[PDB]
């Protein structure tokens, strides 16, 4: 119940033969997994972190210019040459300057003039890559136990370290069996297209090709104290004002320009371990060995009293918190739901089956009431605690919200949203294959399109669809216009 | 700026997005439109930086 209150949770409920259900973790939301006889637990991918990062390429952000040396030839003969030109550390440029008797040359006319300065770089920008060998995912799993201090408690949990070498690490929950994780960590944010821009103690996960296409001069990338820099011509600005001579000026410090050139990148915390916090992971949940505590306990026949007022969460759960008043401590809590004094039992306990483990140890229950009046009976007898509640909503509204949530998931996850909570099945396989093919084609088409250009192109294409009448309307409009507007209204995550 | 000069158009100067001030050579000037330098980053609707 470290999952309550996040506002991003989403409940997986299915189960199959061998009781395996694959769910997807996104660093933002915490999954909840309910089952018929398995204790409902919750999962959250805490932090993805890498280690032993190599440096692929180094970029200069600002420079200093010293030792400006110049040389000119007599006009109409030869071309100005300078021994310092061949040096890798020196930036040079050739220009033509008028010369005459005033300048000492014999014959009037334009003559070449080369100026060579010393480009000693400063404030490098390292660009680091990570191999899949060292990437590590940490996963936290908690079963709904009804402990006193376990409402959205970020700390207490069970951690399982997942690495590509050994990706089938199974958690060992106390008194609940062993939840088995068999996940593929190769999929996810493809780290073969990630270069970390460690630039003055701020990292970023940019695309590889975009990093290679940064105009700033690039170094060899090896570990040296005086690396040679290629493409130095664009961070020093030679200025030939009029035609008498030319000066040499260093451009400046490119940090502010870099920060606005990274306006779409995702930030990652870089201090010590480069613990990335954005990303997603697909994992299978093998719940065969997993059991629930105290299925055989007797029922409670005593008084129950609320110790904290019931307050509905964002998704409809109400978080009942009660304390036992009887003398039989190792006992099971009863439950009942009536809509309009009718035992329709149209409710559900997101907790598996809450049980009191001590006489006066408070226990908290997460129940899902129906959409109307819902009288909830906890104890038995005339002393049964009665929690009146009223969930304000409609069933169709919940379906619309679920559809919107699924659409957002399909927009963020490429096609793994088709596997999120996909309990086996053959229909989901065909859906995933179709979506994979069409999404690959669609992203190959709309590679690197603006937040507003997507909306504009979508409007234009849906208008084209509404115009054409050769049954191109039906596919053009539906397949491109609506999809592209929906995407372009979401892309800026 | 930084021992350099340029002859820019007045309106273009007045248009560029940087935090300006009265330029009265007094101490502790108050800058307008400070939001052009600071960038607040709410990560997971958990906290702000």
């Amino acid at each position: 119940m470290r999952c309550v209150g996040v506002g991003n949770r989403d409940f997986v409920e299915g189960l199959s033969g061998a009781t395996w259900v694959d769910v997807v973790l996104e660093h933002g939301g915490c999954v909840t997994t309910m089952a018929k006889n398995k204790p409902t637990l919750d999962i959250e991918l805490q932090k993805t972190e890498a280690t032993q990062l190599a440096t692929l390429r180094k970029l200069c952000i600002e420079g200093k210019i010293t030792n400006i040396t110049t040389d000119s030839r007599c006009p109409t003969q030869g071309e100005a040459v300078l021994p310092e030109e061949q040096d890798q550390n020196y930036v040079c440029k050739h220009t033509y300057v008028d010369r005459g008797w005033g300048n000492g040359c014999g014959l009037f006319g334009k003559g070449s003039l080369v100026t060579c300065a010393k480009f000693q770089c400063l404030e490098p920008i390292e660009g680091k890559v990570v191999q899949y060998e060292n990437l590590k995912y940490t996963v936290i799993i908690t079963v709904h136990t009804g402990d006193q201090h376990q409402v959205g408690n970020e700390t207490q949990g069970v951690t399982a370290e997942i690495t590509p070498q050994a990706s089938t690490t199974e958690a060992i929950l106390p008194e609940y069996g062993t939840l088995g994780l068999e996940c593929s960590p190769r999929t996810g944010l493809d780290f073969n297209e990630m270069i970390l821009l460690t630039m003055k103690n701020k990292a970023w996960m940019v695309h590889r090709q975009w990093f290679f296409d940064l105009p700033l001069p690039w170094a060899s990338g090896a570990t040296t104290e005086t690396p040679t820099w290629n493409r130095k011509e664009l961070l020093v600005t030679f200025k030939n004002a009029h035609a008498k001579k030319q000066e040499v000026v260093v451009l400046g410090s490119q940090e502010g320009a870099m920060h606005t050139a990274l306006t779409g990148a995702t930030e990652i915390q870089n201090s010590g371990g480069t613990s990335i916090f954005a990303g997603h992971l697909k994992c299978r949940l093998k719940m065969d060995k997993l059991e629930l505590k105290g299925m055989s306990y007797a029922m409670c026949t005593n008084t129950f009293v609320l110790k904290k007022e019931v307050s509905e969460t964002q998704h409809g759960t109400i978080l009942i918190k009660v304390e036992y008043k009887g003398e039989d401590a190792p006992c099971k809590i009863p439950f009942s739901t009536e809509d309009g004094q009718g035992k329709a039992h149209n409710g559900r306990l997101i907790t598996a089956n809450p049980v009191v483990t001590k006489k006066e140890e408070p226990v908290n229950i997460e129940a899902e009431p129906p959409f109307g009046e819902s009288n909830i009976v906890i104890g038995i007898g005339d002393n049964a605690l009665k929690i009146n509640w009223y969930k304000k909503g409609s069933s169709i509204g919940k379906m619309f919200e679920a559809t919107a949530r699924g659409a957002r998931r399909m927009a963020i996850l490429g096609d793994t949203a088709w596997d999120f909570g996909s309990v086996g099945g053959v229909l989901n396989s065909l859906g995933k294959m179709v979506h994979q093919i069409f999404g690959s084609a669609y992203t190959a088409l709309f590679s690197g399109v603006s937040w507003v250009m997507k909306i504009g192109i979508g409007v234009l294409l849906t208008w084209i669809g509404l115009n054409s009448k050769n049954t191109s309307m039906s596919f053009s409009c539906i397949a491109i216009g609506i999809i592209t507007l929906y995407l372009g209204a979401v892309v800026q995550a | 700026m930084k021992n350099k000069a340029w002859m820019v158009h007045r309106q273009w100067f007045f248009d560029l997005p940087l935090p300006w001030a009265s330029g009265a050579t007094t101490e502790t000037p108050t800058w307008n439109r400070k939001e052009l330098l600071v960038t607040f980053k709410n990560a997971h609707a958990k906290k702000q930086e």
Epitope: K200, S271, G272 | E27, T28
Partner: antibody, heavy 122, light 113 residues
Framework: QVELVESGGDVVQPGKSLRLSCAAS????????MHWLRQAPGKGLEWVAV????????YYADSVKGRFTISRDNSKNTLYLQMNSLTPEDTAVYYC???????????????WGQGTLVTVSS | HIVMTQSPLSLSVTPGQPASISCKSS????????????LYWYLQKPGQSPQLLIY???SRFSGVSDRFSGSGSGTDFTLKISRVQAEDVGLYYC?????????FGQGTRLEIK
Amino acid sequence: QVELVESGGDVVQPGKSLRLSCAASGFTFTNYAMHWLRQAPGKGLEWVAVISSDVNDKYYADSVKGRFTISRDNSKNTLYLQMNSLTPEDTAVYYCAREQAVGTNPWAFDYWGQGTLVTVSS
Amino acid sequence: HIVMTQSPLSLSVTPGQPASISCKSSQISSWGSDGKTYLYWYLQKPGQSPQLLIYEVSSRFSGVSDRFSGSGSGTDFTLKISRVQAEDVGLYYCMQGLHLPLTFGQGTRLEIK
């Protein structure tokens, strides 16, 4: 590229006051808090006094509190330290530290001056 | 008046070897409002003026070699050097910037063994 050069350091007998001056260059001075730090020979670095961006606000180390005075001539781009009632203990190499260029602390050191030596002895 | 105690007082290490310097505080230097930890590490090279290596607990300063990295959360901070060169001779004075009367440590010394 910033250059902080010391001035005013010389010999002085105990009890005779002295005024130190820190000349600054390479940055806009009026926006930077400045510090005075000293290192007695063979002793750890010991911060002396700080003046913030606004001229009025100043603070001094308790070991030297009430004996020194720190002033800012930002129009001339220089810092002033006034040493009064000097003690033979108060002999050290004195430094001039700028405010941090990047960070969160209102007062920090990023660039240290070349250093001047003041000797208080008889 | 937080007093800074450093664990090592002399560190003689051969070149191409790691090194660990410890600067232990008398109080947690973690500013509550921002959650940062203001501990600085300077190096005064012999016959030179002090530099600034790591301007936080672990975020190194500009112009510093690749090997200098720090750590520590509340009171036990470290300065890790990966491969010692011949230029690392100096005095690694740590410092706390949490409180106004900021005080340096005694400062360790590094020499080539």
